Design an enzyme around this catalytic site. Structure first.
Site, mmCIF file in Angstrom:
data_model
loop_
_atom_site.group_PDB
_atom_site.id
_atom_site.type_symbol
_atom_site.label_atom_id
_atom_site.label_comp_id
_atom_site.label_asym_id
_atom_site.label_seq_id
_atom_site.Cartn_x
_atom_site.Cartn_y
_atom_site.Cartn_z
ATOM 1 N N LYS A 1 -5.973 -4.547 24.397
ATOM 2 C CA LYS A 1 -5.373 -4.032 23.168
ATOM 3 C C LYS A 1 -6.651 -3.331 22.459
ATOM 4 O O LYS A 1 -7.550 -4.084 22.034
ATOM 5 C CB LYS A 1 -4.463 -4.969 22.442
ATOM 6 C CG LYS A 1 -3.368 -4.331 21.542
ATOM 7 C CD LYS A 1 -3.784 -3.312 20.526
ATOM 8 C CE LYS A 1 -4.330 -4.005 19.232
ATOM 9 N NZ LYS A 1 -4.569 -2.946 18.175
ATOM 10 N N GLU B 1 -15.165 -13.269 18.723
ATOM 11 C CA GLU B 1 -16.529 -12.600 18.246
ATOM 12 C C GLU B 1 -15.941 -11.863 16.809
ATOM 13 O O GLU B 1 -15.471 -11.229 16.769
ATOM 14 C CB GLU B 1 -16.884 -11.485 19.079
ATOM 15 C CG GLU B 1 -18.377 -11.098 19.212
ATOM 16 C CD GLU B 1 -19.405 -12.039 19.828
ATOM 17 O OE1 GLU B 1 -20.418 -12.263 19.492
ATOM 18 O OE2 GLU B 1 -19.101 -12.182 21.056
ATOM 19 N N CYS C 1 -21.291 -5.999 13.675
ATOM 20 C CA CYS C 1 -20.971 -7.408 13.232
ATOM 21 C C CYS C 1 -22.389 -8.212 12.676
ATOM 22 O O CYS C 1 -22.357 -9.119 12.032
ATOM 23 C CB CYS C 1 -20.079 -8.122 14.007
ATOM 24 S SG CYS C 1 -18.453 -7.457 14.250
ATOM 25 N N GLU D 1 -19.264 -9.617 4.120
ATOM 26 C CA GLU D 1 -19.566 -8.528 5.005
ATOM 27 C C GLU D 1 -18.969 -7.229 4.602
ATOM 28 O O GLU D 1 -17.935 -7.074 4.437
ATOM 29 C CB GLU D 1 -18.849 -8.844 6.336
ATOM 30 C CG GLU D 1 -18.980 -7.803 7.441
ATOM 31 C CD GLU D 1 -18.786 -8.189 8.847
ATOM 32 O OE1 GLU D 1 -19.494 -8.358 9.691
ATOM 33 O OE2 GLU D 1 -17.450 -8.264 9.073
#
Ligand SMILES: O=C(NCc1ccc2c(c1)OCO2)c1c(Cl)cccc1Cl
Ligand SMILES: O=C(NCc1ccc2c(c1)OCO2)c1c(Cl)cccc1Cl
Ligand SMILES: O=C(NCc1ccc2c(c1)OCO2)c1c(Cl)cccc1Cl
Ligand code: NA
Ligand code: NA
Ligand code: NA
Ligand code: NA
Lengths: 494, 494, 494, 494
Positions: free
Chosen positions: B186, B262, B296, B393
């Site tokens: 996906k 992750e 990330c 973040e």
């Protein structure tokens, strides 16, 4: 914190050990082993030769026969037996440390805290490997199932030196027995006693007869017989580079037995100008003088950056001038006698040579006692790459200090050797430590330390310092014969 | 060198890939993918849902059937196919680079020299592993032959993010295909195009139909159907920590499929007073601003020792003001737009939230163009650990600069986080480097560098930054199911 | 030679174990544990809950702090400690074996000769791994030195079942402690006592306080508390597939802790018409009935080729009827009671289910005594795949025998299960063996044996029998966290 | 389905290859290589000796200097180079296939479908290993960080035989180059052409100058030069056990270079009475007659159980008589000529001994064509262990069939040899298969197949068939030199 030693340990084993029994030599000959501190004989020992080696090889071969107790034993049980051996050695640690000191000359404190500790750690390390050195299952092309079996190489001939008698015995036995081999071991004439006693403990531990066989004697005889024997599958030899040459030829001349060697060195100890002065001085002292200088990896070329040369040298002389030489049973003794009169005389020779070829005698340079083989800690400064003392292994308490300017210069000078056993680098700089550790052509590179061994980490030479590695997982490779089995299957799938 | 780009490259694949064929969604519904640089639609894409994932999974299951072409193919051949795919991707490199920039917004020069280089290197690395991930033969107790087969886990669901569309596809397909798994992937609604073109190349390279199926669509729809599917054996999800938890819950509620994750980060970049200033400044800029800050593992907490703090902040603001923001196809551009409007708003929100808590806005803070989601390179100075911008973040071009005094301090402050994806340390000192790399609780610790990735070296989070590792040998582990086969034999021998 | 058991051993430990000390529950609550042989209370045990778990986790976290005695301890010494624990367990073997039987119900001869022996073997095996699970040095692109540290995952919550109380404790402690983790363990309320006594031995062995903590209590309380804890890094759970689901959802809802599961099974035992009949019938009986049928990998689907079906069934029924049920301390006893009244009732329900859905009851089918929870060994024949007794784990002495014709048929039927813990094949034919071992979707495939376990060989589930592996080198994987260190170097060379 | 051969391919390379250039021998002497099918000279070739070897060693040493392009090259890039070389060899496949047949004599169909396929597969396999042969990070005792660097051994001398000219070159180059070594290669005077052509392809591929050097010449000159060279770090020799001993003695008498040997065999092919008769007969034929019997692992002792002996012998004789001999470029040809006059005469010599000693000559026995070194497929029946043809390696199309009774008997007989390269077992029985594979003292045991090689699976000898393994991961070991770097750290933590 150390148990008081028995300063006159009794000897209980001094014969040939074959099939868990003690034999005289076929010739009935014996040889003396001496206490290096007094120069007096300890006892006579069975003088093994070719015929005796022949008995031991047949005994080991028998033990190795398919379906024997040793071959059928669970791998995990081999580990049980190694652990039991370590236990018995611990039980008898105080005695073994003293007997080691008696026959070898090394200070009892060191035998106890260093040598016997490392012997226990080695055997217990390898005990753990016994059932974990897996073969592979392999995704080969076609409708096949392919795998490998890691089998024992077979009858292993093991020749060990006099500088670390018990530790070297352990370095050899650990990996050998962990992988299910059988051994025929030749111990040094200068220090046969402690390995002989451990043989008794191998019996006590329950190893089947013939799995470990020990033949004391001389090299031109017992040792040569092993390397040349037609039914010895593998030889592991630790000793001079000169003799390692004899061993490999004899292996080529005989049955093409697999060979590993651990030989001599002239290892560079590199002190950069940003080094911690105090730490580096003490470490360089340790690197060289440890075990009366009788270490193959001794830091016998001390390269010191010119900016710190004068001070490093001054502090190094002060330390050497204050290193206590005396009876190895006295807890204050830092340095015992050299192993025998031959080494005693060879080291004195090198001292004489270093003076003649223009090296600057900074301290020591003489005999340190009138009985036994004691030599004053000796320091040569202003040493040049071309001098004999800068190229040849002295194997004694003789230090070489050399001066260098740049990191590129030193790398070249350090690597300009046919030896390559070990090396060290003292520096606070990350980039300098990584540059040098990569660039140095040596089996082990220590950084801000020296002589740091662990049963976990492999040890061995580059160049003419040997081939193959001992310790670690790597120590198992030389003791494994690999068998591929490839099987047709109806239809291979992932 | 970089070929001139086609700034409006044609789109050839915009549907659902199943059995090497292109399908409309079963609903026939589609969704827009937008050009981040203009805010305008690039084209429509099939909107995959649960019914479309079902088809994809049934196809993958059929391809994984014992005796199927994919199951029977030699391991080395899976490797050949991966190398062929890489070759095809390189053939279309200039096209793929430009399409990546069009859909994602990153500078074409970076798409070409970094992203595509890394895709090729990943695929070629994993091609090499196809026939080398051995099982074991095991010295089990008793009269048995025991070994393990490393089989594929089966049908793997793989959900990738929008920040590195092609590279994230490669990080997933490399290991999965190398080990013989089949895939239902996906892709991000923000960036479906390049991944769908690569499906074309997969077919062209000769991978059997059903081995890789791709379903573009939404998170709560397609993505959820994968995570919750009863016949999917394993899910790998890269994305935010928040959605990372939806995935693990969906696995547990359904078939207890294996999960790797992750997730997000807030990685500390630590600059010690003895760092190379010039290097540290550029690297810190790079560490944060790369890929429009959409990494990330962005170094989004820049800790600087007090002695050099001032100089560092001045140099860092000079560099952030010099960073060129514009059309990603223009060769001068260092920074493209953020991936979409939602990200655009969110990052702007974070900047506001920081000008609130008394952090010194030192530059940027606002929109940088009246067309497309461009945001000004922003720097916050005198940031404190309690501030929202020091904790959450941001995923945008927003740099946080914090001050610290001692090494013990910065360790604790760096570690004081529920994130632990990466970290960096800049220093010339051997010991400081070793102290910090050991002490830091992070999946990767870079020393004197940042964002150094290699297919050879594993990457993954500690704590809530994810679990499992990608890249390296380690990336194979999550894609392997281990089978023990233990066989009665007549008489085991070593 | 089994020493005579104390049929009523004294209980020395019945509290919560934290920091090497015994605590009552904060609430002061206790719960009775029952002797499944008499149905009468043995004693009371501290009933730990959320607050007790919290204390344990804090103690574990504290023992895990950088610089703590457990973090600083030589890897090799962790091995010494595991080895000492094994020695103490062996010293107290007779007691622990008697205690195990009192609390659990399994025959004392089996507790002594099987369970205890396997505990010692597991612990001594992992002792060896402590200093051997190497990280890597990696040939990464560029001018970098890249390597991996294998660090402990951290605070590990371990939830263990009642079927093999001591053994399951060892399977969990071995790998966890070998790799330097710290433990908060929840033991089963049916069988808490042996684990607690072992805690005492952990203290005696010299493990630092907080390295192992044990909280006796119930599932929805102490168990859920560990699974949902925000400071627990990793959870390992052995239990029913149904509770495994709850554990995974709990991990996802909380802090994304790492998860492994060892769950249920419906393992197929496949008997080919060319199998040794006598051996196949004994092994088939053993496979199903061992430990009162309370084995996750029970051979609870016995597939028998039609040519030999009538004879196998006749022989199986005869073996079942002669199976001696009674006092577990009586050497004559093969089968003790089921573990508790809850299991007792569940098994009676499945027995009735079998009869209801048309399975042919060939022997037993009822209650074997009045006191305790004894069930007649029961055999159903002519079992069909769609039957509930053919699909669901019964976890009792209830055997299912099904008839098959072809090897291709039996592969599909064996594999048609949501479980995949184990399987077995009995045949003399090389090709039939390799065909089936490859095709069967199970974590362990035994050939011509069953329930052959070795600390050396991994064990675990496919599908919904769990994820991850225990035992072998594989058992270390889930207890390790991988950190990459990537260092900039002046010039990379091979 | 083999592309048509060029039956008279032009020769392009016939000189010494050093630094990517072509050189005449310093002495300008040359030597003829002959087409064994016609006995007519193909061309002259540079006759390298000691001086040319010294030139090649200096080139290699230079290419290996720290900081050189080969040393600094990314390991992944070494892999790229290997894959490129493979692509080039694939481009030139029919040409190399035809030139192989022309110079060696083996049928072109086999050269094409077997030799060149295996060359491609071997090179591509090792390409993948280039960046995956990790060193270790090691949990050593104490406050240290310890790891290993897997460095190249350095200058590798490689001496290859004439029986598989291209494949043997690939078996040596694959591992040596994958691990970043440099090579000085001596090719067989009987077949120097294909290897020199591959040198052109190595240059074309991009390998830096000096990384691969090829010196054609004679063994007692060029070969002995390599083995005794003071600056060759390692030598790998494939050839007769007789010469292998020269190699190991040179090593010992020169610089103690590391040595691996792949020598001769007298491999036993064991047919149990339950084998598949048709298969076993065709495989026994293949096992011996493959490559004109010029295989080190030829199944040259065919042991057949007395119950099927007569039928097996008749079937084997029938298959031998129908074996087509003649022009290697003719598609119907199964067997070409022997390699040269020396081999031709030695085979006829062994056939003579076979008759003299009373072995039943069942078919063939002499010359098979009036031109070229063609020998008839020869079968001796009822061979006895003591016969010269049962003991010595014939290396031609001469089959030995022996009769045996028990499985115990035949193990003892098969293992009664100083050779141990390979062995094979044919049986339908699981236990017999496992018993024999374990019991046979050989480097590879094939089950229900023969001569099944894969790049994935190791190959090498027990006893005097050699030492070391080629292919697989194992094949990298002899080409790596291990370095331990042990670093002092502030405080070691797990
Ligand atoms: O005492 C040590 N080495 C001395 C030593 C020197 C030469 C050797 C040796 C030990 O074992 C064999 O050769 C030592 C040190 Cl200072 C640190 C860590 C581990 C060790 Cl074993
Ligand atoms: O007694 C054994 N298994 C019994 C057993 C059954 C189920 C189990 C178990 C042991 O440990 C956990 O589950 C057994 C056997 Cl017959 C052969 C080799 C090794 C072992 Cl350990
Ligand atoms: O053709 C084959 N072997 C022939 C062969 C014999 C001796 C050899 C060899 C190949 O390579 C070196 O020595 C062969 C076969 Cl029948 C099955 C699988 C793989 C292979 Cl390579
Ligand atoms: Na002595
Ligand atoms: Na887009
Ligand atoms: Na109980
Ligand atoms: Na020729």
């Amino acid at each position: 914190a150390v148990p008081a030693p028995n300063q006159q340990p009794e000897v209980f084993c001094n014969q040939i050990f074959i099939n868990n029994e003690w034999h005289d030599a076929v010739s009935r000959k014996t040889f003396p082993t001496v206490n290096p501190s007094t120069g007096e004989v300890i006892c006579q020992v069975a003088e093994g030769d070719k015929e005796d080696v022949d008995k031991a090889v047949k005994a080991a071969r028998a033990a190795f026969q398919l379906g024997s107790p040793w071959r059928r034993m669970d791998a995990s049980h081999r580990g049980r037996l190694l652990n039991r051996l370590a236990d018995l050695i611990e039980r008898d640690r105080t005695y073994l440390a003293a007997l080691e000191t008696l026959d070898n000359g090394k200070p009892y404190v060191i035998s106890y805290l260093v040598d016997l500790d490392m012997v226990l750690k080695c055997l217990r390390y390898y005990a753990g490997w016994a059932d974990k050195y897996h073969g592979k299952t392999i995704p080969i092309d076609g409708d096949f199932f392919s795998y490998t079996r890691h089998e024992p190489v077979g009858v292993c001939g093991q020749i060990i030196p006099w500088n670390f008698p018990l530790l070297m015995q352990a370095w050899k036995l650990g990996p050998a027995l962990a992988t299910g081999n059988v051994v025929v071991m030749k111990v040094a004439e200068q220090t046969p006693l402690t390995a002989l006693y451990v043989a008794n403990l191998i019996k006590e531990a329950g190893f089947p007869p013939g799995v470990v066989n020990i033949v004391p004697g001389f090299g031109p005889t017992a040792g040569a017989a092993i390397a040349s024997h037609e039914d010895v599958d593998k030889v592991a030899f630790t000793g001079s580079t000169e003799i390692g040459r004899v061993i490999q030829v004899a292996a080529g001349s005989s049955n093409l037995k697999r060979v590993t060697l651990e030989l001599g060195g002239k290892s560079p100890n590199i002190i950069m100008s940003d080094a911690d002065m105090d730490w580096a001085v003490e470490q360089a002292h340790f690197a060289l003088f440890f075990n009366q200088g009788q270490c193959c990896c001794a830091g016998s070329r001390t390269f010191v950056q010119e900016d710190i040369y004068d001070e490093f040298v001054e502090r190094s002389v002060a330390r050497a001038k204050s290193r206590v030489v005396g009876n190895p049973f006295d807890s204050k003794t830092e340095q015992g006698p050299q192993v025998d009169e031959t080494q005693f005389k060879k080291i004195l020779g090198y001292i004489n040579t270093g003076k003649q070829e223009g090296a600057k005698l900074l301290c020591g340079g003489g005999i340190a006692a009138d009985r036994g083989y004691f030599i004053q800690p000796t320091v040569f400064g202003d040493v040049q790459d071309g001098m004999t003392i800068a190229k040849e292994e002295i194997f004694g308490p003789v230090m070489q200090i050399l001066k260098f300017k740049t990191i590129e210069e030193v790398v070249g000078r350090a690597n300009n050797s046919t030896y390559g056993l070990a090396a060290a680098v003292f520096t606070k700089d990350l980039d300098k430590a990584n540059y040098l550790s990569q660039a140095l052509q040596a089996g082990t590179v220590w950084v801000n330390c020296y002589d740091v061994f662990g049963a976990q980490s492999p040890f061995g030479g580059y160049k003419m310092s040997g081939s193959g590695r001992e310790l670690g997982e790597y120590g198992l490779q030389a003791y494994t014969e690999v068998k591929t089995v490839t099987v047709k299957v109806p239809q291979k799938n992932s």
